[PDB]
Amino acid sequence: AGKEKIRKKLKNEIKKKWRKAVIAW
């Protein structure tokens, strides 16, 4: 449900949208 599909998934966009925010974290 979200274990590894949308929370990062290695980006989601919260990992990338949080890999610094892929820019700002």
N, CA, C and O of each residue as an XYZ file, in Angstrom:
100
protein
N       0.832     -1.199      0.000
C       0.000      0.000      0.000
C       0.870      1.254      0.000
O       0.432      2.323     -0.426
N       2.101      1.114      0.480
C       3.019      2.237      0.530
C       4.360      1.848      1.116
O       5.230      2.696      1.315
N       4.527      0.557      1.395
C       5.777      0.065      1.960
C       6.943      0.370      1.025
O       8.057      0.640      1.474
N       6.675      0.324     -0.276
C       7.706      0.599     -1.272
C       7.069      0.828     -2.640
O       7.425      0.173     -3.619
N       6.123      1.765     -2.696
C       5.425      2.090     -3.942
C       5.172      3.592     -4.022
O       4.979      4.144     -5.106
N       5.175      4.244     -2.865
C       4.950      5.685     -2.805
C       5.208      6.196     -1.388
O       4.311      6.214     -0.544
N       6.449      6.607     -1.147
C       6.873      7.122      0.160
C       8.329      7.454     -0.013
O       8.970      8.141      0.783
N       8.801      6.916     -1.111
C      10.119      7.065     -1.596
C      10.201      6.199     -2.836
O      10.321      6.723     -3.944
N      10.139      4.876     -2.675
C      10.252      4.001     -3.839
C      11.613      4.252     -4.465
O      11.976      3.716     -5.512
N      12.335      5.099     -3.759
C      13.635      5.589     -4.139
C      13.412      6.885     -4.901
O      14.127      7.173     -5.861
N      12.393      7.692     -4.467
C      12.062      8.955     -5.129
C      10.648      9.227     -4.996
O      10.321     10.307     -4.504
N       9.710      8.355     -5.386
C       8.309      8.738     -5.197
C       8.130     10.116     -5.821
O       7.493     10.368     -6.843
N       8.772     10.942     -5.066
C       8.974     12.310     -5.158
C       8.896     12.673     -3.716
O       7.971     13.366     -3.291
N       9.901     12.195     -2.916
C       9.874     12.535     -1.456
C      11.051     11.864     -0.887
O      11.080     11.350      0.231
N      12.031     11.902     -1.738
C      13.231     11.161     -1.574
C      14.220     11.567     -2.577
O      15.424     11.321     -2.509
N      13.629     12.200     -3.504
C      14.126     12.762     -4.710
C      13.436     14.042     -4.662
O      13.923     15.096     -5.069
N      12.214     13.898     -4.120
C      11.561     15.140     -3.769
C      12.013     15.181     -2.369
O      11.540     15.961     -1.542
N      13.009     14.259     -2.104
C      13.648     14.314     -0.777
C      15.028     13.731     -0.859
O      15.628     13.402      0.165
N      15.566     13.589     -2.111
C      16.971     13.163     -2.236
C      17.724     14.388     -2.188
O      18.765     14.568     -2.819
N      17.140     15.283     -1.377
C      17.516     16.656     -1.275
C      16.375     17.328     -1.759
O      16.451     18.497     -2.137
N      15.339     16.695     -1.780
C      14.306     17.224     -2.504
C      14.812     17.097     -3.826
O      14.595     17.909     -4.726
N      15.586     15.920     -3.938
C      16.464     15.814     -5.079
C      17.035     17.187     -5.285
O      17.645     17.488     -6.311
N      16.819     18.038     -4.257
C      17.368     19.429     -4.459
C      17.430     20.288     -3.202
O      18.262     21.189     -3.097
N      16.545     20.004     -2.250
C      16.510     20.744     -1.021
C      16.211     19.979      0.185
O      16.179     20.454      1.320
N      16.008     18.850     -0.111
C      15.629     17.863      0.935
C      14.263     18.260      1.510
O      13.745     17.581      2.397
